[PDB]
Subunit: 298 residues, 6 copies
Amino acid sequence: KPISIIGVPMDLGQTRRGVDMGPSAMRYAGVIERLERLHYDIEDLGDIPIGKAERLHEQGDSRLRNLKAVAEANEKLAAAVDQVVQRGRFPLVLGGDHSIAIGTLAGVAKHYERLGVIWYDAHGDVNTAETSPSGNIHGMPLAASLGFGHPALTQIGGYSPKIKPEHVVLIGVRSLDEGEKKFIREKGIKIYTMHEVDRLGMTRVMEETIAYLKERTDGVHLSLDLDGLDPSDAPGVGTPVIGGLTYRESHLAMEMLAEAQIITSAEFVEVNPILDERNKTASVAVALMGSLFGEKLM
Amino acid sequence: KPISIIGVPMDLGQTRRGVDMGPSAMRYAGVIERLERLHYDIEDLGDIPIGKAERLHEQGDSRLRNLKAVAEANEKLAAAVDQVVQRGRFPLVLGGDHSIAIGTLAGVAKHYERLGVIWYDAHGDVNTAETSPSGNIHGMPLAASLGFGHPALTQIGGYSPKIKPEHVVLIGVRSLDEGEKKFIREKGIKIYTMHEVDRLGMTRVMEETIAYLKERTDGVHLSLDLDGLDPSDAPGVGTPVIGGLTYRESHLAMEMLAEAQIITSAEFVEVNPILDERNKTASVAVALMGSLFGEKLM
Amino acid sequence: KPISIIGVPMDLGQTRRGVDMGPSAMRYAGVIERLERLHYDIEDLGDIPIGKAERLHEQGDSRLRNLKAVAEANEKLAAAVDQVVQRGRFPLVLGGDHSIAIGTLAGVAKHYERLGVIWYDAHGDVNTAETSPSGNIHGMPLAASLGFGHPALTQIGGYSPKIKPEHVVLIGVRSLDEGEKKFIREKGIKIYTMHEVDRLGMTRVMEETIAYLKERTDGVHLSLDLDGLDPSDAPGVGTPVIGGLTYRESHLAMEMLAEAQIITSAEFVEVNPILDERNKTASVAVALMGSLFGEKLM
Amino acid sequence: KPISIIGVPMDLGQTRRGVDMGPSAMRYAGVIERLERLHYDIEDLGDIPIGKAERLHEQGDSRLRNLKAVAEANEKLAAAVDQVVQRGRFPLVLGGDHSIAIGTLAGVAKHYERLGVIWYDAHGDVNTAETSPSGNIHGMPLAASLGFGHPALTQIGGYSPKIKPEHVVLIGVRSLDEGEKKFIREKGIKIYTMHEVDRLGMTRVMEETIAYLKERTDGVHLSLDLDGLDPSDAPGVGTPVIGGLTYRESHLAMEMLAEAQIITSAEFVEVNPILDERNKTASVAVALMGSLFGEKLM
Amino acid sequence: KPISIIGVPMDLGQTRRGVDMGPSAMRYAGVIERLERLHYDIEDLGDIPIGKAERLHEQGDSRLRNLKAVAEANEKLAAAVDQVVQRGRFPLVLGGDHSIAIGTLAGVAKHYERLGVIWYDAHGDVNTAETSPSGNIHGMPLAASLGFGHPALTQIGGYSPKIKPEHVVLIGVRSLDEGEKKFIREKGIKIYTMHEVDRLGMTRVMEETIAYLKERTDGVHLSLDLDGLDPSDAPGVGTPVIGGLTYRESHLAMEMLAEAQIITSAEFVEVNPILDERNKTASVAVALMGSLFGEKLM
Amino acid sequence: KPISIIGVPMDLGQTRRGVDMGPSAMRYAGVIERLERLHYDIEDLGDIPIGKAERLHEQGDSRLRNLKAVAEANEKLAAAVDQVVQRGRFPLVLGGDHSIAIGTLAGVAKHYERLGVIWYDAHGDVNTAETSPSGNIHGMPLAASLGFGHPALTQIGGYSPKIKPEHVVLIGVRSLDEGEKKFIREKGIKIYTMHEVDRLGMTRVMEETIAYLKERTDGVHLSLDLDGLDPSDAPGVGTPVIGGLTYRESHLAMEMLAEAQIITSAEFVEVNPILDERNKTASVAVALMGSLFGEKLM
Ligand SMILES: [Mn+2]
Ligand SMILES: [Mn+2]
Ligand SMILES: [Mn+2]
Ligand SMILES: [Mn+2]
Ligand SMILES: [Mn+2]
Ligand SMILES: [Mn+2]
Ligand SMILES: [Mn+2]
Ligand SMILES: [Mn+2]
Ligand SMILES: [Mn+2]
Ligand SMILES: [Mn+2]
Ligand SMILES: [Mn+2]
Ligand SMILES: [Mn+2]
């Protein structure tokens, strides 16, 4: 299936500038050439126009920083992703902070009866305005997509929820707020924190994840936050948490997913060149995309 | 069970100065705050007064550096740990070089019929005055506690031995003198060197260790030397040995011990700020203590 | 005098992608806030729209890579800089590779009888299509501004030359092609290579430079290439050359220029976040701009 | 003249824990051995007992954090330094944050008609309870010693002021609050910021300093804050400021001071092992002490 | 079985100078001492004289750089290894680039009915003069030894092939040209790329390898290219490929090989001190040799 | 004047292996290409055959390690350098530890009435068998060449002494034994330690050195030990000493010597690849040689 790349130079979902440079850092890391090498019909649709943050004293949003601009940008993204899916192409979204997942899922979910989601991240991203200790929307996209949060976020695309909790699988988590633990626990979301990765090993984690989703969904969206990997492997991220997934574990995960052929849409987020070491993180992302799309060692 | 922290600013069990700063480095790394967050009744009893080393020519002997000061400090430590145990609290000892294990075990062992011991370290610490190539008492605590060594060390607390060889499990070993290998072999001490960790994996090493001990002891003491971890994860130690346990493997080990609920006493030793990189080692020790006491990712 | 910032996200003057991220990396390093702190009336005019490189097989340009797009972008820049000067404001241009100097000087020079230029760089940038060993236009802006080069470059702004050789001063040079040495020698351009900096010291270099220019010009443009500084201080540059100017020498230079009050326009170029270490180079640039605009330690 | 070392394990003058480990990190860096090698009669008087800070909520002034304990400890230090000077010995004080300079100067100043002061630091430390943006007393010792500040600090030792503004020379300054610049300007304190060091060179700065003081004082106290050196040379400090004095410049300054024979008392402060790289900063301090006391390359 | 060390200071099989320093870097890393400590009768036969490459312009085949000198040196190596095996000693060959494997195998293979080969490398080294994208013979030794390639290489020692494809096992592969994948696929060579190592784990990879070979061979040659390990563990190599085998995995593999007692000859190649970090790679090679020859942690 | 390069792969003058790899490390760093680029008639005569160290118990004595092999190698070196000089060529010797200076000076001195010497090093190298704390001959070459030391070293070439004390200038010294300071003081050898470099600056040090020598010699030999530079610039050396000469200071020194045209012979010693970071030190040596032989920035 042909691929369409959509860049979303968004950094309004959090406070550290630079993640808006993530899409082009990945383009410069060679994403197009990497995928073309695999014989793909790859198209780069450019970037979604993002707004400027309105003055703090003006718009109401501290538990929901930059709400209107984040919501607006996500509406455009949803529309663009929806168009790509309708054209029979695979939407590959490059961020940009994780709040863009709201738009990506909005444009994709409507096309599936039961869309599954693999949230590869050091965090749960299941906060709401009420539980968020920072007010950063990039920590709320999963909750919002499940229909929990501000209507400006949950209603993007004109429908809600995008997915069901039983169709989500979190992988690599090692930093959850108490409210998020409660959310995950109560909604019954499947989760493999670093404890399970260490205890069962990435192979088993992926086998169980793949079997779990293939058994109850008709499509699977991969939402990969580079901070899921250890900061030593992916230093250019805004919210690094030590004790993460290795470069090799991540390649294995992508290779196993490619093998399973269950991934119908994907997004690589949180790449911040401004906090990186010589584009290492963008390069890691591109290498992972390579494996995801079928690149094999043999 | 409430916890009582006892600091032992000891560096006389070896020759590199700075390990005496280990108790406060860990305090500054936030040990109290970490454990309070877990809803523990945590008490900091301060530090054991350590004497100044007596001139080697006057001390016990060339093969036992700083014998009297090490012994005296361990007597006071045993007394303190004994009182904590009698108060129904969990004794958490912060070192300080490994020679303090003699006092910790002296204060705890008397309270159990069959005390087990998990010696997490890159070394076996089973040397005696006769086998020691250095005379550093921090390389003799396990042997002394088993009743093998100078009476000044074996008799601490007024009884001997503190534990039996069949109730000890060494984990992470990768540096043993030939005499130590002989001691371990002859005493029949259970041991998982890095070979077994790599071959079986940390999950299996821990499962076997827990089952082995739970099956024959009525209490288990964890004696953790930060040099058990690889120097890249725990650089601030006096005797680093490459090819060590990772940060993740260590957290898994602590989480599995916490889950088993077999740990009745613990000590974190060999933290030397003076050989460290921005208190990294003390911070690792605190994070590990967090996991040991029940901290979970989910 | 009020300042107007113009970003030029240009990387077509050379081959390493990422320098087009230089303007926003500097904005994120806090350039606006830094200058506002000094009580300046600072305005950010945004970025000059830059084109996409046409296919190699199509347009004639190997000794002059991306000529049309570089020329086009520079025409727009010249127009924008000209407007700013006409409004009585100081034009502060952020790059972007050094080829943008062609547009900056085109927009500025026409307003002065004898515009001087301080070219702070590890290179001379005096190549022509005939002498360039790479065909990269970012190594030709000084020659082009002096009226030597392709008419598409020398005629930007509708006039030529922008400045005279006797009004230019190169500082920090340590990498010149033989043709460039000949050019500098023959045109009689004043130059302080690292040999003179080491031998005379930065204080003398600047005193002589300031006295030389103040004595024969009615305005001075500072064209600062971050690669003028040593790669250890400014690692995020496309053409690093060891044995460069120190962070302190650069601050001294900027402070002395600020003191002399001879700088009437400036541009900071070659910042490439993609080759940098956590925005260090953009940060250095901002600190230097701070000193240039009057920031003092006392 | 024999030397008496007094350690002051103080960290209450600021908020980063660890600087209280500075005295012993320097002892472990070999300060006694270094000085004995120079044929000095050296005596280590131990450490000044420092009190624990009382609960912030029940404190007297937020603009003066830990006032009582800082003042208390400084009184003891003043008495100790006073004793040493009365015995005809040179007081060498090891810190500890810079707030200890209040006690050192209190113990020394009473013994001289016109005591001079060389404040080698990246900061001025001339804030008061009214001007301080933090309430950290380590940012107030120079002002307090000149008689400006809270009486609890200015009256230590039972007299004030300790020194006159015309007898102070600041060297290496690169971080001053606006209030501090005003203070320095108005009191007429001689100051060589990094601008002057870069412009004039360390040799000239030192010749002028020595000549200025030798001409109007009968004793000179050296108060050296390790943060005066660049963070690359002295990383273990709580308030690092880039663009600092080099290792070599610092040795030159100490060697020129030794040559002049004007230093009658000294203190090395702000060494924080917990923020350091394998005791590098403590080692630098010890090497500088060596030079100060006469160690020569030839 | 006594060991005979033969150094081959060869760098002609590739283009990066320095790998010819590999034999002595390993000697300086203490290879003799390491093995003697294990009670081995160890003999160092010195280095094979390597000829100088003749001028490229006057060479016979561009697809086979330095053919004559590589072949010449490999003939001498084959004769030397042959001699060692005839004396009943174990030939331990130190390189030198991988092209020396042609001589090592030529000298050993004639002595076994069915010689097995474990090729521990990031690459397959199965290119020929026709498939090679570089003409570097170090990328052709495995193919040549199997009888595929230029007769100058396949006929070394006067016979061919040295081994059968069904008796070779590639371990750690992560960089194969398309021609090489085709070669491996078509010849039916057993291969464990990094995908299999990650998926199955090193223990399983080694158990399968040992069982596979032990079942069909009467001797096994270990050809270990240090680039098989991750560049972070073995930086001093000419063709580094990220995502490699860890230090620990390599020790485990060597220890399991030692345990199986199947290795009858070995070579450690591609160590380049000139591209290394303080002899780290040579040291790794020596530690691995220690494990291979029986060194145990307990 | 044409140049003849002679390599001396010597490491017997000290105890750290690897310095014998220095001649080829510099060759690989491109020494021939660098000098050819300057239009020199450059000839590489190869390496001097160095014997293997004789058992210390049989050699000269405990105070002169490897005496006979060092002496024999220096005899051959003197003969080779002598022939080069007779052929009217400039002898450029690449080491190899500093003990080779004995042979170099032996081959050159006989050809001059009053040969001068610039000893660029962190050390004085003026120890004798009696004063040497190690017995390493690389710490005795300057003294031996002045006729002070074991006759096996002082008589090399059949004459003694090679140079007079008043014709020697030491530059960059910062590590002298007390006996060496006494030797330098008593023999009246001109010396610029790091104190004078910092106080006067490298320009003045060089101007005085050149004028001093030009005024009393008819030829000048440059004996450059890479340890003269700071370990951060030249890490690959056996005896590093912090607080050294910078990369820039060294280039200035070479450029000024080139400009003066007083250097008639030269040697670059102590380069140890095995203690280096990717041949950085050999590369520094080559760049310095470039400057020495006339390479100019402009
Ligand atoms: Mn996320
Ligand atoms: Mn995350
Ligand atoms: Mn231990
Ligand atoms: Mn240990
Ligand atoms: Mn430039
Ligand atoms: Mn440049
Ligand atoms: Mn201070
Ligand atoms: Mn300060
Ligand atoms: Mn290979
Ligand atoms: Mn390879
Ligand atoms: Mn030397
Ligand atoms: Mn030296």
